[model samples]
Target: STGSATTTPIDSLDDAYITPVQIGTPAQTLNLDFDTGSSDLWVFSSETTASEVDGQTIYTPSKSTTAKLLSGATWSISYGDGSSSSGDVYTDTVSVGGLTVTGQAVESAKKVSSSFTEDSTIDGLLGLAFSTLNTVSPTQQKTFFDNAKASLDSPVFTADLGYHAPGTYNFGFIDTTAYTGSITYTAVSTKQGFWEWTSTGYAVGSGTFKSTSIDGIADTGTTLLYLPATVVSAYWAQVSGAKSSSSVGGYVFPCSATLPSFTFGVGSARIVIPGDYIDFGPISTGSSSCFGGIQSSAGIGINIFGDVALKAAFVVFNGATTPTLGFASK
Candidate 1:
């Protein structure tokens, strides 16, 4: 059966969206981040140290009769921002929306970085990437989507992220009514366990679209859009008093700057990012300076179309024979 779930923004943090997920037999409800960038379903659990638990909810396996340990299986993951989590594995029934996947490998966190422990609202992460990216050792595990795909009417999902608003994530089917205009489809390379693709080119503001090719991944978990350093510099140069601030990290500009529009090309389609989205809000409270939403990829090697860019359009993460990405105006 097809299923759909609502993704809501976390308080004032516009970086990531969270969805309700039920785990184990009795169904312990937890709000998780549906991340397309990485593959590993993990949650804060009784295994986590009390000091590290903070205000986050922990999954209690003893409460679920169906929960079973995966022997010696374990998982460890480190995000680009240096946040990390590691844990042992347990096979349990995991459900999202109305779809349920039995024998889903649910990693129980024993260790978590400060970034995660401090985020009281985020209980865990639900990875939507390919199974190849799963971090379970001895034998890698399949993601919840991978296990449930065969039962779905179609092996597809759509992400409709919003700015400070609730959005929807659809499984097995696409709702045409959610978006306007035609979806421009582009081929995606899943070789790196990500929805990686190359853009035809980009342009700053109302300038003519350049023919530069850019390779990047569509990452729902990442907060900011990361491009080449050269591209970031060019965009920031258009704004007065804008400069790279080591103190502030990345590029910072006056909060009142008249920012320009940014556009990325997908075939003949132009996905435009308004200036206001790029402003990213103030760098700190009581500070007139603001950090840029788009930054340099630098050591990351590939660019990332994070929430800042994904929220600007309706996206389809097509899981057909050859994975594809479909973009359309929202």
Candidate 2:
């Protein structure tokens, strides 16, 4: 049977999408961020410091008869945003949607960074990346998807992220109704434990599409689209009142600026991001200035097709031999 789950956006930070997950035998439900950028199912647990556990739900292993500690095993993870979490490991029954995976590795967070602790609604993170990226020491752990793939009818999953709206993640099956038109498939390079691919080229507004290839990763956890500095500069140059603000740390333009659409080339397929989406709302509350969703990937080493880019299309993360990424208009 296939597994499917609904991903909803948080009101405070529409940056990441969250889904409900059930862990342990008794099944403690937790709202977790479904992050494709990393591999590790970590959750706030009873082991966490009482002072640090504010409004978040804690996963109690002792309450689950099926839970067993992995002797001496532990895991820790750090994100690009500087958020981190580390803790002991446990083997338990984990379920997503209606599918259940027995003996799944569940990392119980003993310590969490301020970034996670401050977010009361998010109890943990469910990683969808390759299992090679799992951080468990001594013995690397497999993700829930990795363990469940063997039993699935098809070893694949589709990410249907919506813009400030609810979406669904389908495992082992692709719902054709979720996307329109034919899917444009591209070979994925998993060398970096990411759904990495090269874009044939990109264009600003209705301008000519450049043939410059761009290497990037498809990341659901990240909020903005990060491209080469040269590309970012060129796009912002077309805006009338655009400026690189040091305080804001990116390109910001007047709220009323006539922004142009941006398009990225994947093989022969062209995916276009509308101008209004490029203007990522306002910079701050009651501010007339807006921050550009497309930014320079200067320090990031590689460009990232974050949520801003993923939401524009329906993505298929194929797990078949020589994995491929299929994209189509939603």
Candidate 3:
């Protein structure tokens, strides 16, 4: 069996990608962000307070005959901003694309942070990372991919992220037509419960490849690409009238400046990030300056190869015992 789904961006900035997910017996559909950075399938639901709910849709388990409460099971996830969400659990019939899974754990949010309530674009999050990162207590629930892998034709999923357009996520089988060029596989370290891997190196625009390995995670949940200060500096140095801004955060440059492309190596794959993608739109509604999509990860603890990088290529999360990651040009 196999499953394929379309992920549409929440905005022209590609802030996040979301797909419709059906929950419960009668099918209550909600748009969920498939986050490769987190490991919990949580959603806004009837359990959440009315005050915390905004324009987002919510799932109602009571309306579904097959929904059952997972007694004593609860989950919570905190963020760097200090905002978080906590919820109870339920087992229900869940479906995405053309695939369905029975007895899938669906967390219902009881409390949500202001940030979540304000963001009406996404109703919830479906974590695609390792189950080890799941926040459910007493019993750790399996991720949708983890639980559906055995029934799938293959335990693999692919992310074809887009720029200013909708993209795709595939489970079980690789669609050869989705990408051009040969796929390159690399080792992934699941120790931190992330799709963590190191790039062989990177090249700033037309410069030759710099042969230093850099560790980072292919975090689709995040919107921007973050690298070391040195790489960030090198890339910005070539752009005229670009400077790191303290008020706006990260680097900002003249919207009319000629931006250089960014390239990173995965095995033998040389994926190039188009300069336009780095422009990250304008800084404000009518501002003449633009925010740089590639920012410095100096204080960020770990570098993040977020949607900015993912949009340039097709990414495969090969859930084999060895858990290797594959990259390809599209």
Candidate 4:
């Protein structure tokens, strides 16, 4: 079976994307983030602390007769930003787009962090990463994609991330019309439970290609693209009056600065991130210092190929016997 869903940016920050999903018997619809960075189908639920339920919707398991509590099963996940969330686990009939899973594990948040509470745009996360990365304990659960992989027409899902626009997430089959040109395939290393792959290096504008293998993960949940200092510094260096300071947290430049295009390789495919895409936005309200979309992954150990890069190409998260990633320019 194949299914399609529309995913939209949560806010102007393009910080996260949200897709409407139907859960439980009566079909409580909630906006969820399809996070490829982590594994755990968790959400804001009725069990969540009252104080944490700001403008967010809660999932009431009692309302769904199909919902069953997973005895002794629990899960917790933390953001490097010092915030965390943990909760109880339940299995229920979950549906995305037109595809339905009879008993998908649905983690209910009993507790939430300030960041999550403050941001009511996203209700929860539907992990697209491998099941090995699932945070559930005592009895690890599989992701919706994993449980539906066998019955799927192709055992894969395609991500068409957009910038300031609506995108789509297709499961079971690849939508050829979503992309242009032939796709480039590469093996994935799920050693750390991510859509990790090796990027074949980069080039600044019309410069030469630096042949190197940069290991990174394709995280749709992340807002910006993060690379090594060498690449990030090089890109910033090309922009006039660009500075990497602690003031704005990363590289920022004059609003009028001419940004250069960024090109990175994924096997034989060359994905180009337009110069305008790199000029994220002003550091503050009506500020002349614009933040760079591409930043250095200094504290973070792994490089992040986030929405900034994913928007440049069509990505496929293949869950076949030997998992692989497919990239195609559109």
lDDT of each: 0.91, 0.89, 0.92, 0.90
Clashes of each: 0, 0, 0, 0
Q: Can you write out model 3's per-residue Cα lDDT over 1-330, one digit (the tens) per residue?
A: 888999999988888899999998788999999999888999999999899999999999999999999999999998544668999999998888878889999999999999899999899999999999999999999999998999999999999999999999999999999999889999999999999999998998999998779999998888899999999999999899999999999899999987899999997679999998898868989999999999999988999999999999999999999999999999
At residue 327, give the lDDT of candidate 3: 96
1 or 2, greater by lDDT: 1
Candidate number of the best lDDT: 3
Q: Candidate 4 residues 1-330, lDDT tens each?
A: 988999998877677899999999999998998989888899999999999989998899999989999999999998645777999899999988899998999999999999999998889989998889898998999999998899899989999988788999999999889888999998899899898999999999989988889999999888889999999998888888999989769999999888899999998679998887787778888999999999999889989999999988899999999899999999
Candidate 4: where are CA atoms >4 Å away?
Answer: none
Looking at model 3, the pairs that clash are none
Task: Give the per-residue lDDT digits (tens) of candidate 1, residues 1-330.
Answer: 677899998866586789999998899999999999999999999999788988988899989999999999999999989999998999999988889999999999999999999999899999998999999998999998898888999999889998879998999998999988989999899999999999988899998898888999999999889999988998999999999998878999998898998999889899998888787778888889988998999988889999988988999999888889999888
Q: What is the lDDT of residue 188 in candidate 3?
A: 96
> What TM-score, over all chains together, does every model reach?
0.98, 0.97, 0.98, 0.98
Q: After superposition, how far is residue 7 of candidate 4 from its true place, in Å?
A: 0.5
lDDT of 2 by residue, 1-330 (tens): 699999998763467788999998789999899888899999999999787788998899999999999999999999998889999999999888888999999999999999888888889998989999999999999988889998988989889987778999889999999988889999899999999999999999989999988999999889889999999999999999898898998999999888898999889898888787676778889899988989999998989999888888899999887898989987
Number of clashes found in candidate 4? 0
At residue 59, candidate 1 shows an lDDT of 97
Q: What's the lDDT for candidate 3?
A: 0.92
Quality of model 2 by C-alpha lDDT: 0.89
